[PDB]
Design a protein around this ligand. Structure first.
Ligand code: JPV
Length: 281
């Protein structure tokens, strides 16, 4: 049982050691498309690339490239698109991907500014009456409503395909209180946030995969998917204690490199799953 293994690693202070075994064991696949010179300005970070096999392709004939991976968890029957925070020049591509993949939710785990630097372009409208047009991808985005709570904001957006005049409702779930350094002390508000995404229907098989991002799409984004998948497998399995978080992480790392960036994020993920287990009751 992971709780016992938790106190073992804790009492022994072996978190950096576990974290390094995971690093060593992690899959390494080609990322040739990401490294083409023409894609240099489509990438926020030069050492964070989608693998070619799991990369999301835009349906534009010119350049199909976005820094985004499909994570397919076969046993849990859950898919996720993990992406970087859009750049000023990729906001149109981002919304084109949401459109093309039939996503219902966008989960954002960062602030636009952290540590005095921009982690993400402002890619959604701040007011009802000032909608955004992405001329490169022929999309219009309107803020319909905004519900600001202490730890997160939920926004209803209308995305319109200007070419076909179809419209869809997108839910923007914005976790606003992740600290600039380290991880939250308690996972209570992160679990509340995750249960809210679940309740919305955004993670359901009726819809395209949820789009999850932070700044690189690997650290906080990693923690989100790892916790969701581990909890769902504990519901599905005859023996809930057969769920090994280290195995689930390594399976997810076949689809996108670097998921979970620090031993602190690993620690926090264990804590989120341990506490989420004792919610279901
Ligand atoms: O104190 C231990 C008891 N069992 C688990 C729950 C838990 C711990 N530490 C935490 C900090 C914040 C929130 C919950 C926890 C340890 C692991």
């Amino acid at each position: 049982e992971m709780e016992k293994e938790f106190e073992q690693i804790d009492k022994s202070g072996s978190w950096a050691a576990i974290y390094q075994d995971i690093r060593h064991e992690a899959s390494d696949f080609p990322s040739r498309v990401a490294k083409l010179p023409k894609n240099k300005n489509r990438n926020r970070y030069r050492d964070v690339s989608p693998f070619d096999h799991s990369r999301i392709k835009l349906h534009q004939e010119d350049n199909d490239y976005i820094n985004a991976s499909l994570i397919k968890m076969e046993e849990a029957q859950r898919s996720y698109i993990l992406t970087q925070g859009p750049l000023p020049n990729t906001v149109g591509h981002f919304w084109e991907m949401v459109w093309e993949q039939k996503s219902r939710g966008v989960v954002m785990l960062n602030r636009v500014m952290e540590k005095g630097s921009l982690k993400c372009a402002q890619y959604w409208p701040q007011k009802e009456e000032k909608e955004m047009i992405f001329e490169d991808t022929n999309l219009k985005l309107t803020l319909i409503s905004e519900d600001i709570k202490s730890y997160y904001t939920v926004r209803q957006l209308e995305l319109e395909n200007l070419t076909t005049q179809e419209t869809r409702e997108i839910l923007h779930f914005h976790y606003t209180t992740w600290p600039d350094f380290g991880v939250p002390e308690s996972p209570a508000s992160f679990l509340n946030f995750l249960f809210k995404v679940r309740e919305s229907g955004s993670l359901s098989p009726e819809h395209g995969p949820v789009v999850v991002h932070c700044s690189a799409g690997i650290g906080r984004s990693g923690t989100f998917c790892l916790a969701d998948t581990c909890l769902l497998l504990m519901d599905k399995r005859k023996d809930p204690s057969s769920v090994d978080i280290k195995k689930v992480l390594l399976e997810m790392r076949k689809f996108r490199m670097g998921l979970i960036q620090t031993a602190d994020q690993l620690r926090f993920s264990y804590l989120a799953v341990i506490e989420g287990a004792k919610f279901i009751m």
